[PDB]
Structures are given as C-alpha cells and as structure tokens.
From a paper:
Using cryoEM and following single particle-based helical image processing, we have explored the structure of the potyvirus [name] and its VLPs. [name] virions were isolated from infected plants of Indian mustard, and VLPs of [name] CP were produced by its transient expression in Nicotiana benthamiana plants.
The cryoEM 3D map for [name] virions shows a left-handed helical arrangement identical to that of earlier characterized flexible filamentous plant viruses. The cryoEM map does not show density (we could not model them) for the first 65 amino acids at the N-terminal end, a flexible region exposed to the solvent. The last 16 residues at the C-terminus cannot be traced. The N-terminal arm of each [name] CP interacts with other two subunits. There is a side-by-side interaction between the N-terminal arm and a groove in the adjacent subunit mediated by hydrophobic interactions. After a 90° turn, the N-terminal arm reaches another subunit in the next turn of the helix where the interaction is favored by complementary electrostatic potentials. The dual role for the N-terminal arm that supports side and axial polymerization and the nature of the local interactions (hydrophobic and electrostatic) were also observed for WMV4 and PVY5 and seem to describe a signature for potyviruses. The density for the ssRNA is clear (red density in Fig. 2d) and each [name] CP subunit spans five nucleotides of the viral genome. Residue N103 from one CP subunit (Ni), and the pair R204 and R209 from the adjacent CP (Ni-1) interact with the phosphate backbone of the ssRNA.
Author numbering:
A (entry chain A): 66 to 117
B (entry chain B), C (entry chain K): 118 to 272
D (entry chain C): 170 to 221
E (entry chain J): 222 to 272
Write the structure that this text describes.
RNA sequence: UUUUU
RNA sequence: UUUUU
RNA sequence: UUUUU
RNA sequence: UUUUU
RNA sequence: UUUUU
C-alpha cells in the first residue's frame, strides 16, 4: 500500500466544472529558493555586466 | 490572458502553475515591476507581468485566494525533504521550522484549522504593517495659479 | 478520508490499524507537523498527516477514544514477551514495569477497572500539565493606528 | 438598503432563531465556524452559536 | 548532552538525567520574534521643491 | 509483586 | 466540556 | 515538539 | 439610540 | 472591505 501527496478531490478553482487547473504533473519542480527571488537579479544582467 | 498570449491550449495550466511560485516567494501588490521567471531544467525562460494585473476588477490577492492548498501540500513535501522556509518570515524573523505552513503573503482562514498558528498569522500580519496610511487623495488637476486677464494690449 | 486517498477497499482497515501505533507512541494535539510512517518488513513507506485532523468536528482524542482495548491487548502481549514500556511515562518517569497498561495519552475510565492505577493516571495527567492557560483570545484584525484624513491637497 | 427608514440591523433583528437552529444542525454534522470570529480569533468550537 | 530514553534502562540514573537536564536550563526563553524589516520612521513626502 | 550493591 | 507533542 | 555551548 | 464590512 | 514588495 502506497500513494502520492497531491490529490484531485481537493477544493480547487474551476474555469468551468470539469476543468482542473493546477495540473498535477508538478511533482518535480523545486529549484533553489533564492534563485527565484527578486532580491537576486537575473542571469542576463549578470552577463551584461561581465561583458560591459 | 487567453487573448494576450495566444496559446489555444491548456498549457496555461502549466503556466499558471508557474505563476503560483513567483507569486509565493515575493510580495503581492500592484506596485510591482521587472519580470518574473521559472525554469526548465537549467534554463530560465522569462515572462512579463503587467496584463495579469491590469485586467482584474478586484485586486490580485482577491483572485489568488483560491490557490491555497496546492502550494500547501507543495511546501509540505519539499519541506519534508529538506529544511525549506520561505522568504516572508525570514524578513519577519519566524522561529519554528515547523511553522512554514502559513508564512504566506495571503491566505483565507477557515473552520478546519488550528489555534496556535492563527496567532502568528495575525500578529505578524498587522505588525508587518506600519506607517502607510489610508491617505485618500493625491492632488487635483485644475491648477491655475492665476485667472485669465481678458484684456487687450495696444500701443 | 475515503474521498482523499482513493482506495475503494477495506485496506483502510489495515491503514487505520497502522495509525493506532504512531497515534500511541507520540502525543495527540492539533499542533503536529512532519509525517508519520509504519513498516512492512524492513521498509518504511511513509504517510501524511493533516486531512485526518482538519476533517473531524470535535477533536482527535474525541474520535480515538474508541480504540482502547485493542492496543491494550497489544501491549499485554508484546510486553509479556519483552520489557516494553511506551514513551509517555519515560518522559514522566514511571517506576513499575507492570503499569505500562495505562501510560497512554488518552483513555476513557470505566466501571470495570482497578483502583490503584487510577491514581497514577490522574496525578500524572494533571501534573503533566502546567502553565498553559485557557487564555482565550489572540488579537483583532481591525488595526488602523490612525483615522482617515478625508481632505484634499492643492497647491 | 435604501428603502428602510431605520438601519439594516434594526430590520434583520427578527431573523435570529432560524439561523440559530441552522448552525446548530450544520455544526452538529461538521466543524463549521463562521467568519466573524475567525477574524476576531474565537477559541471554542462550541461557541459558534453567537459569532454573529 | 543528548540521549534517547528507552524501556531497557535503570531507574536511578533517570533522576539525575532529567533533573540535571532541566535545571541546567534557565532564563533562556521561547521569546519568539526578533524585529521586523519594514522600518520607515517617516512617510514619504510626495511633494516638490521649487524656487 | 517490586525495593537487599 | 476544552488545554497532555 | 523546540530551547542544554 | 447610532458607530461592528 | 481596502492598505503586507
């Protein structure tokens, strides 16, 4: 006996009724936390400084 | 949005699933600029902001109040693996690693929920506010420092 | 739960039989996080927590008060083999190896029961409490440190 | 609202016991609590009776 | 500094373990919060300087 | 029944 | 009645 | 549950 | 009496 | 109700 975390009967928004929006294939998405923030800048900027 | 980005697809499922995350890790206000981005492996394909904001009649929190339990289970998993904590408490100095569950910018209280964490939610809510006022009005447009003269020049 | 974990089976029999044990060896309160797990041989297939708690109208003790005598006979057997004692007394310093019978977090007294152990049950109950108060309220939401001005700025 | 001479509370003061029994039932089924305390941090699930 | 009590262990030493545990603590509090980041001792003025 | 250094 | 991690 | 330098 | 979003 | 970058 085993199972998964995410579910489908959960209370979730619905455009129309049958639709479930937060598609439950997102099991694999956990990049670095700080890497996503705004407090760190972007890779493009980091490049253009390094080139200028 | 469907008019904007021209998908003809339910890939917007995946997109909005992305928007969950940048919505989480940072603040929620009209006062936003820049961009946001998620990843695909090691790539960083970016994405813009504004029309997801200028095209809702009430505010942004008042729409994202749905997406509550999905990210809840998200953080449950990826915290169970590793000691994640989000941003919003690290600026406000939470203490317990357990209580990551409700270090959001947004949430809707319900009658299925514990007693303890409510205290931190509300205290850290209001005390995280200060100074900014209702302060209704800016200033008006009709700004004539003088009145028209209504005369004539002649020699 | 049947809506949650989607079994279409009375395997939940076996599951709840599992929940007995982690329910036993550790505390009972809404203030819980993490996970729990039981085993199958040498494996440690884990399992989550919350929706078994957010979906009962009175509390968790007020539902688990049934499962009394099953674990009772359980500990009778596996103590008869070996000197088991549970956790809850080892934090509270029981003395008698015999009196493992009622070192639970929870129980319902009945009119078929001895005299002696009642004393330890109730004393170790209340004295194991201290300090935590009824302390009803937290704090309120309407927090405007000032009043709206209701004026205008002009040059 | 624009068509009552005293206020809105001063008219709805009738409808007291109907919703009272309402919440008694649908709380007896399940742990409902209303909004008005959840903003004000009630404690007892029993005392939903008067969180109006 | 650390140990896990078990049901194979004596009676006597438990006393010293727990007494010397808690009494070796003192003073330090749960004392949850530090202080917050949004620290503007004033509000923006939102005006203009001119001659 | 425990408690005998 | 609640409050036992 | 945390808090033992 | 009003004033509880 | 709004106001949490």
């Amino acid at each position: 006996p085993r199972l998964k975390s995410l579910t489908s009967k959960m209370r979730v928004p619905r455009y129309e009724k049958r639709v479930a929006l937060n598609l439950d294939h997102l099991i694999l998405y956990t990049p670095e936390q700080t890497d996503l923030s705004n407090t760190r800048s972007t890779r493009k900027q980091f490049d253009t400084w390094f080139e200028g | 949005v469907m008019a904007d980005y021209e998908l003809t697809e339910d890939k917007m499922q995946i997109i909005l699933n992305g928007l969950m995350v940048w919505c989480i890790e940072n603040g929620t206000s009209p006062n936003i600029n820049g961009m946001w981005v998620m990843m695909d492996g090691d790539d960083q394909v970016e994405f813009p902001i504004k029309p997801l904001i200028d095209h809702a009649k009430p505010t942004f929190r008042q729409i994202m109040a749905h997406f509550s339990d999905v990210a809840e289970a998200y953080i449950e998993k990826r915290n169970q693996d590793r000691p994640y904590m989000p941003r919003y408490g690290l600026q406000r100095n939470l203490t317990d690693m357990s209580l990551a569950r409700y270090a959001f910018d947004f949430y809707e209280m319900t009658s299925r929920t514990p007693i303890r964490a409510r205290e931190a939610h509300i205290q850290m809510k209001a005390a995280a506010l200060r100074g900014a006022n209702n302060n209704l009005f800016g200033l008006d447009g009709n700004v004539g420092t003088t009145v028209e003269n209504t005369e004539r020049h002649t020699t």
